[PDB]
Amino acid sequence: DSGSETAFREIEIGDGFLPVCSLGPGQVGHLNLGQDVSSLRFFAICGLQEGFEPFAINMQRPVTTWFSKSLPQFEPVPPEHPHYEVARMDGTVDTP
Amino acid sequence: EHRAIMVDSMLHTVYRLSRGRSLTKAQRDVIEDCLMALCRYIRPSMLQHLLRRLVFDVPILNEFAKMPLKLLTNHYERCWKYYCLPTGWANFGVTSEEELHLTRKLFWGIFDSLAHKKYDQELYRMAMPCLCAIAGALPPDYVDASYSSKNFDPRPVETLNVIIPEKLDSFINKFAEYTHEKWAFDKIQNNWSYGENVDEELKTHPMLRPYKTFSEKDKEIYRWPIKESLKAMIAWEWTIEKAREGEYNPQPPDLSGVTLSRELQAMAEQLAENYHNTWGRKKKQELEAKGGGTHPLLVPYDTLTAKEKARDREKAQELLKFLQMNGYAVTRLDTSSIEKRFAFGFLQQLLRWMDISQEFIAHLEAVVSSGRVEKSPHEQEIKFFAKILLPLINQYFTNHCLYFLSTPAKVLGSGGHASNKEKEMITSLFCKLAALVRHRVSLFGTDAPAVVNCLHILARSLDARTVMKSGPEIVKAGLRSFFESASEDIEKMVENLRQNLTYTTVALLPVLTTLFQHIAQHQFGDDVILDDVQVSCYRTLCSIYSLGTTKNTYVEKLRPALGECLARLAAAMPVAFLEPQLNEYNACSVYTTKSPRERAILGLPNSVEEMCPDIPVLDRLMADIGGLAESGARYTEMPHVIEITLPMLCSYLPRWWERGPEAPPPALPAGAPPPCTAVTSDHLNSLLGNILRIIVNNLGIDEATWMKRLAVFAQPIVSRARPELLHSHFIPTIGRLRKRAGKVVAEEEQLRLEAKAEAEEGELLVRDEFSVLCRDLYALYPLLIRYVDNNRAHWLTEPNANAEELFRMVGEIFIYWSKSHNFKREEQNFVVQNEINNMSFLTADSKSVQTSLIVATLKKMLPIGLNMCAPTDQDLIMLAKTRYALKDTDEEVREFLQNNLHLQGKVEGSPSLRWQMALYRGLPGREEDADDPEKIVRRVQEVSAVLYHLEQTEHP
Numbered sequence A: 001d002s003g004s005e006t007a008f009r010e011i012e013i014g015d016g017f018l019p020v021c022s023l024g025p026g027q028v029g030h031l032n033l034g035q036d037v038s039s040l041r042f043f044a045i046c047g048l049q050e051g052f053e054p055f056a057i058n059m060q061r062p063v064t065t066w067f068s069k070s071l072p073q074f075e076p077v078p079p080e081h082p083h084y085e086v087a088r089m090d091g092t093v094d095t096p
Numbered sequence B: 001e002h003r004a005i006m007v008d009s010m011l012h013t014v015y016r017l018s019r020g021r022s023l024t025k026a027q028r029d030v031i032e033d034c035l036m037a038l039c040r041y042i043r044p045s046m047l048q049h050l051l052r053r054l055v056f057d058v059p060i061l062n063e064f065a066k067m068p069l070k071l072l073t074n075h076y077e078r079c080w081k082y083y084c085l086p087t088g089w090a091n092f093g094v095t096s097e098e099e100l101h102l103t104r105k106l107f108w109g110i111f112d113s114l115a116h117k118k119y120d121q122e123l124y125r126m127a128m129p130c131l132c133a134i135a136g137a138l139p140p141d142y143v144d145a146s147y148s149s150k151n152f153d154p155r156p157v158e159t160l161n162v163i164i165p166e167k168l169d170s171f172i173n174k175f176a177e178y179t180h181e182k183w184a185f186d187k188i189q190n191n192w193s194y195g196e197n198v199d200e201e202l203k204t205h206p207m208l209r210p211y212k213t214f215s216e217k218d219k220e221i222y223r224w225p226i227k228e229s230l231k232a233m234i235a236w237e238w239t240i241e242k243a244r245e246g247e248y249n250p251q252p253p254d255l256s257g258v259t260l261s262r263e264l265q266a267m268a269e270q271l272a273e274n275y276h277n278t279w280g281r282k283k284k285q286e287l288e289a290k291g292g293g294t295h296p297l298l299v300p301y302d303t304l305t306a307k308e309k310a311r312d313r314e315k316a317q318e319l320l321k322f323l324q325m326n327g328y329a330v331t332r333l334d335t336s337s338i339e340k341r342f343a344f345g346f347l348q349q350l351l352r353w354m355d356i357s358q359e360f361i362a363h364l365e366a367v368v369s370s371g372r373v374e375k376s377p378h379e380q381e382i383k384f385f386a387k388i389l390l391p392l393i394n395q396y397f398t399n400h401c402l403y404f405l406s407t408p409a410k411v412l413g414s415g416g417h418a419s420n421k422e423k424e425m426i427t428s429l430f431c432k433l434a435a436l437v438r439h440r441v442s443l444f445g446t447d448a449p450a451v452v453n454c455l456h457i458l459a460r461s462l463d464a465r466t467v468m469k470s471g472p473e474i475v476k477a478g479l480r481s482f483f484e485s486a487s488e489d490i491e492k493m494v495e496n497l498r499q500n501l502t503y504t505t506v507a508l509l510p511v512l513t514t515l516f517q518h519i520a521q522h523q524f525g526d527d528v529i530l531d532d533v534q535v536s537c538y539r540t541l542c543s544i545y546s547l548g549t550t551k552n553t554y555v556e557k558l559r560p561a562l563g564e565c566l567a568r569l570a571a572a573m574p575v576a577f578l579e580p581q582l583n584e585y586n587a588c589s590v591y592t593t594k595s596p597r598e599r600a601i602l603g604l605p606n607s608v609e610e611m612c613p614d615i616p617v618l619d620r621l622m623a624d625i626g627g628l629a630e631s632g633a634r635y636t637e638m639p640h641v642i643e644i645t646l647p648m649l650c651s652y653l654p655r656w657w658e659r660g661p662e663a664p665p666p667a668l669p670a671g672a673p674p675p676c677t678a679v680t681s682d683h684l685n686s687l688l689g690n691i692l693r694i695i696v697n698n699l700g701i702d703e704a705t706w707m708k709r710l711a712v713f714a715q716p717i718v719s720r721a722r723p724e725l726l727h728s729h730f731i732p733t734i735g736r737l738r739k740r741a742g743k744v745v746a747e748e749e750q751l752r753l754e755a756k757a758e759a760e761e762g763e764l765l766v767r768d769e770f771s772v773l774c775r776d777l778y779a780l781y782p783l784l785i786r787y788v789d790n791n792r793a794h795w796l797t798e799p800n801a802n803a804e805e806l807f808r809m810v811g812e813i814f815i816y817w818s819k820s821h822n823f824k825r826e827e828q829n830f831v832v833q834n835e836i837n838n839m840s841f842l843t844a845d846s847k848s849v850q851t852s853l854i855v856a857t858l859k860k861m862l863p864i865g866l867n868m869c870a871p872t873d874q875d876l877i878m879l880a881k882t883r884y885a886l887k888d889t890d891e892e893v894r895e896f897l898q899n900n901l902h903l904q905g906k907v908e909g910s911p912s913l914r915w916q917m918a919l920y921r922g923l924p925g926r927e928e929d930a931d932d933p934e935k936i937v938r939r940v941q942e943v944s945a946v947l948y949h950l951e952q953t954e955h956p
Helices: B004-018 B025-041 B048-060 B063-078 B080-084 B097-116 B121-137 B169-189 B216-235 B262-290 B308-326 B342-369 B379-399 B401-405 B420-436 B448-459 B464-468 B473-497 B500-507 B510-521 B532-549 B553-571 B596-602 B618-631 B639-657 B681-697 B707-718 B725-753 B757-790 B792-797 B801-819 B821-834 B836-845 B852-868 B871-885 B890-899 B911-922 B933-954
Strands: B239-242 B328-331
Touching (some): B063 B080, B080 B097, B097 B342, B121 B379, B169 B308, B216 B308, B262 B308, B342 B420, B379 B448, B401 B420, B420 B448, B420 B473, B473 B500, B473 B532, B510 B553, B532 B553, B532 B639, B553 B707, B618 B681, B639 B681, B707 B836, B757 B821, B757 B836, B757 B852, B801 B933, B821 B836, B836 B852, B871 B890, B871 B911, B890 B933
Antiparallel strands (some): B239 B328
């Protein structure tokens, strides 16, 4: 909106970055990672010139992805849960 | 938030301390600054009680309200997202309804008190920021709970003076007994079944008998407050009487939370305010015996926090719901939710002071026509309007233009959409301001810039589609008469040019220009500009073309505004006035929408060519501009074309190009009538070529100053240009500019190497040459910006050798600019002088802070240069760049490049070079002729020099 080309600025590297996409209901998206630049369209238009390596350029095997399963699973309660706490009391003569 | 309660109590006590007496001015300033910083860093959620205290005290508008209203404006400006934005603000969230009614009643009270008070410089100067801040903070689509509503001395109504009539006194007694029964019933629901004797479970009311057995001696003292409440209810203008004919456990529960008729609920809320009046009267009699002071409930009920108000309203609505379940009606109005919106109430205020303002401009016009009469009965109104109302509506419309322009269908506002009623009301308000300033520029001479600024703001954000289609005939006729009066005014000016003269001069016609710009922006021209509006605008464009034909000094200096408004009306006009032979197939034509009888009575001769004969068809103006470009006349030789007609073309042709048969029609039935405009992409390309030809022909003429505005006008016509236009015109123009700039940099280098007073004089001469050079670049290059950005991909994929040649030319231009420090400072000076940064920003959004040449060469076309050069050449680019860092000249670095040609990169060296080579040879336009070493060294040297100057610019 201000006219700057870069979307986000001053981004710390931190742990790292990964390709990601969240599709809504009834949505179809083609996640074209750079397995082959021939499949990568518009790359020479924007990205081959500017100095951006395609993601997984030399990666022989296809890139492995992870999807939100959306299946309720019973997992241990995190100790740092902002709302829920589990406390262990034992050894009382009457209370087990 | 953990300690919000005593934080708020500390806020209240600091308010009391700043309102303390026997304090030195420095001490009061210290406490006020403490309040400033404290409320600035305290979250608005706990500031509600302090804001209530402000809403009580500051409408008095005493000299002692300075810090309260300053706190008002600071807090509201800070929390304008906390209030106005319907979505929860990411910092502190949404605003409570209590705070909403607080700021609404605050705005109302401040405005009415400032209205009734005499003008004072300090008071008005510091109060208008507060009022505009409150207006911006308050959500205009917010609806108050009770639009119809009524230290503090609350006056109760004459409860005992108004004797209760016997037509309902039985019902008064019945409801008193019924409130006692409701006490008993609440106990029963709490499981304390009411016992006749003293009952342990009856904690609130130990002895509690049915009214048959309860003694009337104590029944009277229990029921006296309800008696007084109902006597008050009939003491007001309300009339309570049995709806049905007639007149200790009321199992039907009374639910004060339910909603009834609006007038009935509002009068119940006013009864709650009367309960407040009685309670606050007795409590202030008690409190003044304790030493005075104000109590939170004792503050006015409307300004009171919505929780004590909630309790008092709960009591009053319990009474009211008793009435409507036991058959009693109250009759005192019918305020719609539109009127409950604060925007519509603000508009009612605006129109009431608008009729007051037309009255006072009438009497001040009467007193200035009769010599000079300083004494004015409405001078208070004059000062109040000028110092408060004009900036208030200015800032209000500026920060709520998105909502007001929002339609029920076209909801582009962040929050809600403007109602149709308020939409037409504010359109007619804008018409009323037009009549206010109609031939009335001598008055409000000092306020005229603010008047015209607010006129532009009000002209923007007018959804006149609602007014024209399903809208009031009154406001539609008001705007039509405004357009007609403006057009006949233009006729009077054109006849005179061959007081309304001072009116048009003080205007400079910019409000109409902004109006057609907004109409073109939202495509209002389909319906808003029609019939009489179309005819008036057509005779107006004919008359301003007559002004363009005339060549006096006044019209020569007026041609900027005339051309700008002509282009705006061309982009906001409904029918093809150019080549209008097909207007009868155009459905928007005045003749097609009008009967022949109506054309006869309106004077329309059934021919656009006939009632606008001064301006011929676009084919004829194209032949004219092509002949002018071929002849290469000076800018001052015939300035009317480029001043007026060329902006008109660069606005009309891009707008009507989509309608043209060359462009894809939306549908076959839609395109079944032949389009009135038959322009083509070839037509727009030829017009762009004509503009570029006249620019290159007037490049050396120092009187060619308006080429900057020509470029701004021709930004839209750059799009959809033919690729062949590059080699046809852009290469000669850029090449001539490059050659001239090379001559200038050679002269500048000579003048900088010689040290002498005449050398400094020659350096000043080349400074002037650099300034006119910057003018030439700002006339030439903005077209090239959109050209290269629109056809970047085509020249990127297909290797246009002409595009690479023009890359080399613009690279040489960049080299001259980088090695000329004089050119850089003249660039910045020309930018600040001619406001070039605004045009650069506009081109950036619609493809000194930043350099247009830097954007043109170092950013836009450096990528196509970098793909013209090979990646194996990019393996020598850093070596050539480091040689340029060692400051070796171009021929010299070519020598070491030829000597070092054998260290070119290899595919097997790294996998990156492998796929880079693969893509580079897989480009279909690649040929083996690039393997020639001479071409390689040329391109390596060029790209490395460009990158070296770019990195020097990036890191000074």
